Design a protein around this nucleic acid. Structure first.
Ligand SMILES: [Mn+2]
Ligand SMILES: [Mn+2]
Ligand SMILES: [Mn+2]
Length: 430
DNA sequence: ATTATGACGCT
DNA sequence: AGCGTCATA
C-alpha cells in the first residue's frame, strides 16, 4: 500500500526523428518534399538497399531492408536519394552531422542520452519542477499541448482523428489536479508542455520534424513515441499501463524483440506484456536470470529504473564494409587496399572528433567475417591506437589479422573475407 | 546480397 | 579481452 514503489519519480522523454535520413535529403532537395521517397545505399545490386522511407511511400508498402527494384514494383513513382559514397564505401557523414544539429538543440533543455543517430532520451524531472514553480498553480491549457496524445483517452460515456486527440486531451486536463506539485500525472503533463517546446525548436531551427514520448521511464517513453508517429507526441501515464499492456505483444518492448522475448513467450506460454504480472519475481528470475527477472517483474507494472545517461556523443567511432557473394576479398593486396580505405575514413572522422570534442581514441578494434560464417563477426582483435594516421592504422589492422589467412602462399587470402570493420574506442580527454 | 553502424551484457 | 545480443537509419 503506502510502501509499494510505483516508479513515478521521474519524467523521461524520448525524442525520435521522423523518417530521419529522408528528411535530411528532403531539406537539401526541395523536389523530394511531400513525395513518396526513400534513401538507398548502393545501386548496382537490385537498385540498392532502402534504409529510410517517407510516410507517403510507406502507404504503398515500401519498407526499410527492401531492395529499391522491389520497392519500385509497389510504388513506380518512388523518388530515391542515394547515400554518399567515398573511398569505395557508403559514407554516413551527412546524417551524423544532421544528428548533431538536433542533439545540440535538445541539450539546451536538459542533459541528454544519445540513443541512436536520430533519437535521445531526456530526464525532464528537474525542468518540470521549475516550470511548476513559476506556473503558480495555474492550470494547463490545451493550447500548450497542440500535438499531444494522451494514451488511453478518450474513454467512457466525432469520427475525425484530430477530433479524437482533442477529446482525449480535454478528458485528461479536466481530471488533472494542478494544485499538487508532487502529482505524477501533473508532472508528466508539464513534461509534455516542455517537449512541445523542444520539438518546436527542433523544427524551427533545422526544418526536421520529430515525434516524442513522455512517461516515467525510458522504456515507456520509447513505446509512447511510436504510438502516434509522425509529427506528434504521446503521454503514457502510469495509470494507462494496465490497459496498454493487456494487448501489447511482448516483442514490442525495447530489449524483448529478440531471443529473450521469444523465450518469455515460449517458456511462460503468454503473448502480452500484461500477462507477466501473474508471475512472482523469483519465478521470472528462475527462467530469465536475476537481472532480467527483476527487470521484467517491474517492467510489466510500468516500472523501470534505468537512468538517462549524460552522454551526447557516441563513445566509439567505426567504419565497416561487407564484401558479399562474389566480391569477397581473396587476395592480400585487396584486403590491404580496403583496410586503407576504411582507415582513411576513420582518420578523417577521428581528426574532426578530436577538434570538436577535446578527446582522443586510444584503442583500435579490428573485426572481420569469414565466408561460410554464421555470425555478423567471425573474429575481433584490438591493438593500440597511438596516432591518427590512416596508413599506420591500416598496417596495424593487417598485423592483427594476418594469421587468419589459411592459404599456403601468402599472396592469396583464404578463406575469403566477407566483412572488414575498424573501430576506434577508449577515449580520453585531450 | 539489407548494410552500416553503435551500446551493453556475459564470462 | 573477445563474443553475443539487440538496437536503429
Ligand atoms: Mn526515427
Ligand atoms: Mn530512431
Ligand atoms: Mn525505424
Amino acid at each position: 500500500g503506502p510502501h509499494m514503489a510505483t516508479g513515478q519519480d521521474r519524467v523521461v522523454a524520448l525524442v525520435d526523428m521522423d523518417c530521419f535520413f529522408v528528411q535530411v535529403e528532403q531539406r537539401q532537395n526541395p523536389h523530394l518534399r511531400n513525395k513518396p521517397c526513400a534513401v538507398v545505399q548502393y545501386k548496382s545490386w537490385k537498385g540498392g538497399g532502402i534504409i529510410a522511407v517517407s510516410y507517403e511511400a510507406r502507404a504503398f508498402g515500401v519498407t526499410r531492408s527492401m531492395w529499391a527494384d522491389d520497392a519500385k514494383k509497389l510504388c513506380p513513382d518512388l523518388l530515391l536519394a542515394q547515400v554518399r559514397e567515398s573511398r569505395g564505401k557508403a559514407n554516413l557523414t551527412k546524417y551524423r552531422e544532421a544528428s548533431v544539429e538536433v542533439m545540440e538543440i535538445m541539450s539546451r533543455f536538459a542533459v541528454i542520452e544519445r540513443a541512436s543517430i536520430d533519437e535521445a532520451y531526456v530526464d525532464l524531472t528537474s525542468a518540470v519542477q521549475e516550470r511548476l514553480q513559476k506556473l503558480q498553480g495555474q492550470p494547463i491549457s490545451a493550447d500548450l499541448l497542440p500535438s499531444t496524445y494522451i494514451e488511453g483517452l478518450p474513454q467512457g460515456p466525432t469520427v475525425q482523428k484530430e477530433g479524437m486527440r482533442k477529446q482525449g486531451l480535454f478528458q485528461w486536463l479536466d481530471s488533472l489536479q494542478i494544485d499538487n506539485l508532487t502529482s505524477p500525472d501533473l508532472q508528466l503533463t508539464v513534461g509534455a508542455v516542455i517537449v512541445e517546446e523542444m520539438r518546436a525548436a527542433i523544427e524551427r531551427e533545422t526544418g526536421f520534424q520529430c515525434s516524442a514520448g513522455i512517461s516515467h521511464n525510458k522504456v515507456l517513453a520509447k513505446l509512447a513515441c511510436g504510438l502516434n508517429k509522425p509529427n506528434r507526441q504521446t503521454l503514457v501515464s502510469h495509470g494507462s499501463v494496465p490497459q496498454l499492456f493487456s494487448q501489447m505483444p511482448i516483442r514490442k518492448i525495447r530489449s524483448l524483440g529478440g531471443k529473450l522475448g521469444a523465450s518469455v513467450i515460449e517458456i511462460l506460454g503468454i503473448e502480452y506484456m500484461g500477462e507477466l504480472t501473474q508471475f512472482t519475481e523469483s519465478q521470472l528470475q528462475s527462467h530469465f536470470g536475476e537481472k532480467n527477472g527483476s527487470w521484467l517483474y517491474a517492467m510489466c507494472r510500468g516500472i523501470e529504473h534505468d537512468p538517462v545517461k549524460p552522454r551526447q556523443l557516441p563513445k566509439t567511432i567505426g567504419c565497416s564494409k561487407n564484401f558479399p557473394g562474389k566480391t569477397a576479398l581473396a587476395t592480400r593486396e585487396q584486403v590491404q587496399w580496403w583496410l586503407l580505405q576504411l582507415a582513411q575514413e576513420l582518420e578523417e572522422r577521428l581528426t574532426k572528433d578530436r577538434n570538436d570534442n577535446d578527446r582522443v581514441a586510444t584503442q583500435l578494434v579490428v573485426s572481420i567475417r569469414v565466408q561460410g560464417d554464421k555470425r555478423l563477426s567471425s573474429l575481433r582483435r584490438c591493438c593500440a591506437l597511438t596516432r591518427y594516421d590512416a596508413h599506420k592504422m591500416s598496417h596495424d589492422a593487417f598485423t592483427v589479422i594476418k594469421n587468419c589467412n589459411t592459404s599456403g602462399i601468402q599472396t592469396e587470402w583464404s578463406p575469403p573475407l566477407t566483412m572488414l570493420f575498424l573501430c576506434a574506442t577508449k577515449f580520453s580527454a585531450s
